[PDB]
């Protein structure tokens, strides 16, 4: 996975630990 | 998928986590 | 699909997420 | 389909999403 | 401005970003 | 600004970061 | 700033750290 | 695993010892 | 600063120690 | 195990003697 | 300073003793 | 066992004679 | 100074006797 | 056994004659 | 000075008689 | 047995004649 | 001076008669 | 001077008659 996608995924996954899979 | 489409998709998908698949 | 058509389709589809298929 | 016809069709179809097939 | 006019204007303006004011 | 207009503006502005003000 | 706007801004700003203000 | 990913993982795992797997 | 923002800031700042202010 | 990882592990393990495995 | 922040700071400061202020 | 590890182990073991294995 | 901080400081200071203030 | 270890052991053993094996 | 600190200090000072103030 | 060990043993044994084997 | 400290001091001083003040 | 100290002093002084004040 390209770097910008890896980094976007990291923050989206982090937010999901708080708000859920949705 | 071309870059602009990937990026538009990311934001549309992010909005769907809040508002649903609709 | 040509670019202008892709872009028009994107916005029409986005509006449909709010207002329906109609 | 020629470009002007494609473009006229797009707007007529858009109006039909609001007012119907008529 | 009424909604259908706003929406027609949006697409005409979008097309002008590609083809010019003409 | 109404929500659909805000959202259309966001994507048009995003595209302009790649293609210019035009 | 509303939450969805804050979150969209975060990702757009993150992308700008890689690709510039544009 | 690349270094930045190892380091991000360490802090995310540390936070999970306090807040859970979520 | 709200918790999710504090946590996003921490990781963005950590990445900047490696890649710069950009 | 690389030195920085050994050292991080030592402090995390020390904290666990007080706060548990969690 | 809250506990999780104190603990994150400790490890970031420890890493800086090896890699610098950056 | 390397010297710094031997020395850290000595103090951790000494503390355990007072506070337990934990 | 709280006990866990005193104990972390002791080991960090001990390591500095070998590796320097850094 | 190396000299520093012999000497540390002597004092730890001496303390145990007063405080126990623990 | 509390007992555990007195005892840690004794061994650290003993080691310094061999290895220096450092 | 080396001389310093012989001498330490003598005094520890002498103390045990007063305080016991412990 | 407390008894354990007196006794530790005696042995450390005895060792210094052989190895110096250091 | 307490008895155990008197007795330790006697033997240390006796040894000094052979090995010096050191
Ligand atoms: Cl991730
Ligand atoms: Cl996506
Ligand atoms: Cl689309
Ligand atoms: Cl059409
Ligand atoms: Cl417009
Ligand atoms: Cl915008
Ligand atoms: Cl931001
Ligand atoms: Cl980890
Ligand atoms: Cl931060
Ligand atoms: Cl460890
Ligand atoms: Cl710190
Ligand atoms: Cl040990
Ligand atoms: Cl210390
Ligand atoms: Cl011993
Ligand atoms: Cl001391
Ligand atoms: Cl003996
Ligand atoms: Cl003495
Ligand atoms: Cl005497
Ligand atoms: Na992750
Ligand atoms: Na995921
Ligand atoms: Na996505
Ligand atoms: Na999707
Ligand atoms: Na779409
Ligand atoms: Na569609
Ligand atoms: Na159409
Ligand atoms: Na049609
Ligand atoms: Na517009
Ligand atoms: Na216009
Ligand atoms: Na924007
Ligand atoms: Na704009
Ligand atoms: Na930001
Ligand atoms: Na910005
Ligand atoms: Na870890
Ligand atoms: Na994990
Ligand atoms: Na930080
Ligand atoms: Na910052
Ligand atoms: Na350990
Ligand atoms: Na462990
Ligand atoms: Na610190
Ligand atoms: Na610092
Ligand atoms: Na030991
Ligand atoms: Na042990
Ligand atoms: Na210390
Ligand atoms: Na210090
Ligand atoms: Na002994
Ligand atoms: Na022993
Ligand atoms: Na001492
Ligand atoms: Na000292
Ligand atoms: Na004897
Ligand atoms: Na004996
Ligand atoms: Na003495
Ligand atoms: Na002395
Ligand atoms: Na005498
Ligand atoms: Na004397």
UniProtKB/Swiss-Prot annotation, chains A, B, C, D, E, F, G, H, I, J, K, L, M, N, O, P, Q, R:
BP GO terms, sorted: killing of cells of another organism
Domain of life according to the entry: Bacteria
Keywords (A to Z) from UniProt: Cytolysis, Virulence
Family: Belongs to the phenol-soluble modulin alpha peptides family.
NCBIfam families found in the cross-reference section: PSM_alpha_3 (NF033426)
General function of this protein: Peptide which can recruit, activate and subsequently lyse human neutrophils, thus eliminating the main cellular defense against infection.
Protein name: Phenol-soluble modulin alpha 3 peptide
Organism: Staphylococcus aureus (strain NCTC 8325 / PS 47)
């Amino acid at each position: 996975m390209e770097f910008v996608a890896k980094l976007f995924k990291f923050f989206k996954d982090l937010l999901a630990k708080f708000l859920g899979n949705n």
